[model samples]
Target: SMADEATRRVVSEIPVLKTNAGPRDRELWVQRLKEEYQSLIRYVENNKNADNDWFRLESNKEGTRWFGKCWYIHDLLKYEFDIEFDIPITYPTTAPEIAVPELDGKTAAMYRGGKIELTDHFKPLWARNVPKFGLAHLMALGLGPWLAVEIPDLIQKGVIHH
Candidate 1:
């Protein structure tokens, strides 16, 4: 089919994507994470203060799980807090969960353990792109929007403040 041929061509152009070959492939996961790390660096550099958004990715000594943080400036309070990312062992297949350690107990949107719940802000966006979701996509699509929309409301309601 034409669609399959097109997909094949596209996949061929994209390096390091082993489709239907290695599901729990550690090397593939590391490569994807590295690619995402570069993208995040670019994002932070491009939108540093202009957009008041920032992110950083750090890998553990074993280089299995990646820890990351995304921060957005508050429009009203002029303050911000980091939204943490914990990439799972079975990443790429499973989306990394995000959290706000500072706002953990302040709102019901986050779990006690500092894991952000799949609220309306997060659910549909992630549901739209499951299984293929990566760290960059999660930050851009899921947590970014959540910060833009929900953070202000939380501040206004005094859930989050200066």
Candidate 2:
């Protein structure tokens, strides 16, 4: 279903992505192939360089560290979480809106540390709309499963080191 939806979106959005084969089709295929292959190559390269097979260079660099940490935490915790944002540019800063299914499922309170105290004080951290800041805050707030003692200390530290 996801593949179908992705194919449909690509076809509808780009004329080049529409046909079975054409010059346009080649262009679209090349673009999509590059995107998919690049991710795979990056994964391979990162794994090769890191001591731990799971550790990745991309995960260690930039805001990707935070995002990777979040994804790791979500998987470890078995929580259904995802991030999304619209295209329109908004104000001085454009925070990428984040969504967590756990929040909607009412289990978010179980994970929100400090309970009311942290919840009350959390608004200030989101004053900036930068995507990196949003990602940082998301990782910080989501330190539950992320900071669990089972995970290597390095990963837990990496989430906050920025």
Candidate 3:
């Protein structure tokens, strides 16, 4: 029916629900992911040389996993890293776990060979936002904030530097 079609369009415009997302929601999630991926690409292009600004996200054709690269540059030093996340088979109900390969040995904030530890900064924020966690949330609230806090400390301590 026309009303059903209109309802579908409206629901599609809204963000996908994180918990109990169904096939339709999975389709919405993929659509949103592509949109955000393009936006992220444009941001990286526009801010290619902007200080302390860098991030990229890539996904395979299957869309089962995503790869991210980001960095903070300061005083001619670039603290760059790569991360990869796998989509849960039941996704949106559970958020993807982020892995930062380069920080494996530098801090206790990472464990199990590179999985990011849910530190004080991450745990509380995530707990409050449970079931709504997604790729954007993970990047913006999780990895981004982690880098902002950890990179400077790592630099000062000479854990990694150019």
Candidate 4:
């Protein structure tokens, strides 16, 4: 039932998936729709993946703090990279300002106070108002092989303070 519900929801939101009835377009649209749908479902399923790996200790009433692991594709590391998403909200808006968090120890920085401009990567995404789910899809499909290659550096950098 979840699969059927997901399929209906995807077809409803993505008109091309619903009305592109020609065989070739239908095939292409289905493939693309499935890709997009999976990303949405994955984000919904694991919005806390980063936080779960680490503990968020409370500071003052301002916010809780924690640090956790993250990785980039190997080729992209040569270009400098980090990925982030604001906690607690995922929707029809720019999927949180993603950037390298301060290397202090926090799972995620508070919304307005966080820094988001350490690298050029945030620029293009901000310019286009890209959804972070798109970034996750790119990581899975476009950069699969190159993922593990960069983990050693991420570990050495103390990005994962575990």
Report every candidate's CA lDDT. Answer: 0.57, 0.31, 0.63, 0.34
Pairwise lDDT winner, candidates 1 and 3? 3
**Which of candidates 2 and 3 reaches a greater lDDT?**
3
Q: In model 2, which range of ten residues has the least summed lDDT? A: 14-23
Superior by lDDT: candidate 2 or candidate 4: 4
For model 4 the TM-score comes to 0.26
Report RMSD for candidate 1: 6.7
Per-candidate TM vs. native?
0.66, 0.27, 0.66, 0.26
Q: List the residue pairs that clash in candidate 4.
A: 66-106, 66-107
Q: Cα deviation in Å at residue 37, candidate 3?
A: 3.8
Q: List the residue pairs that clash in candidate 3.
A: none
| Cα RMSD to the true fold for all candidates | 6.7, 16.2, 9.2, 14.5
Candidate 1's displacement at residue 12, Å, is: 20
Give the poorly placed runs of model 4, Cα more than 4 Å off.
Answer: 1-36, 40-92, 97-118, 129-135, 138-150, 157-162
Candidate 1: segments with Cα more than 4 A from true spot:
1-24, 49-52, 119-132
* Candidate 1 residue pairs that clash: none
**For residues 58-147, what per-residue lDDT tens digits would candidate 1 score against the true structure?**
766544555656555665445556555555655555666776777777666667857766656445444444544445556655666667
